[PDB]
Amino acid sequence: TLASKTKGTFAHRDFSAEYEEDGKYEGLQEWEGKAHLNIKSPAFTDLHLRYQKDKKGISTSAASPAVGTVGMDMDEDDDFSKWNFYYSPQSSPDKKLTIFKTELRVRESDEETQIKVNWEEEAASGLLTSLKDNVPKATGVLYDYVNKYHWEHTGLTLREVSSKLRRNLQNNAEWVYQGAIRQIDDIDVRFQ
Amino acid sequence: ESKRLIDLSIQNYHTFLIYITELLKKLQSTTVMNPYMKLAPGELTIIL
């Protein structure tokens, strides 16, 4: 039997990663334990994923302030199998919009088997809206992040880089223009 | 443009889903053999 306990922590200037896992292992696939990872980005939205595996349930949920909480729970039993995939919106963390649900049921009488698959349109459309609203959020945070690094390295923005490139190109073009004019004057003079 | 595309996609998805649910029910309202099924607007159950 193996008893595994690991902790990995990374520290830098725009986040910190802290992953703690504990568990036990027997047989060939008899693993049981928990695993919690926490990323804390000052530059971005943080995230915390929790994985749990016990002999009568596998529950994994990731919580991020930007998206919400995406979880999936699997319960296996000799008479029923239940798979649930849910996305709790950040606006209403109390509710768990079941993205999809699967029920496998065996019948102790006769020879029948029930499969029940359920999907929610409301959950799907809500997640779509959450993603389309996080797109501008991601764009803004990434733009501010790259501007912050530009200030860190040079101390400057991006639009000023555009203006600097324009002015330098204009200076070079005017140098070429005056060179052409003086060359025409020189060749005319020497021809005369 | 991304949000416009996503709006059109949500619109088309929600307009398609009722049509396909109707089509599924019409197809399943054809015959009654030993296996049985149940359809709901967001659910499908099958019995062996």
UniProtKB/Swiss-Prot annotation, chain A:
Coiled coil, from the record: none
Compartments, record wording: Cytoplasm; Secreted; Lipid droplet
Induction notes from the record: Up-regulated in response to enterovirus 71 (EV71) infection (at protein level).
Modified residue annotations for Phosphoserine: 109
Post-translational events: Palmitoylated; structural requirement for proper assembly of the hydrophobic core of the lipoprotein particle.
Superkingdom to which the source organism belongs: Eukaryota
Residues where Phosphothreonine is found: 113
Subunit structure: Interacts with PCSK9. Interacts with MTTP. Interacts with AUP1. Interacts with CIDEB.
Function: Apolipoprotein B is a major protein constituent of chylomicrons (apo B-48), LDL (apo B-100) and VLDL (apo B-100). Apo B-100 functions as a recognition signal for the cellular binding and internalization of LDL particles by the apoB/E receptor.
Involvement in disorder: Hypobetalipoproteinemia, familial, 1: A disorder of lipid metabolism characterized by less than 5th percentile age- and sex-specific levels of low density lipoproteins, and dietary fat malabsorption. Clinical presentation may vary from no symptoms to severe gastrointestinal and neurological dysfunction similar to abetalipoproteinemia.
Identification of the protein by name: Apolipoprotein B-100
Protein source organism: Homo sapiens (Human)
Span covered, complete protein: 3940 to 4131 of 4563
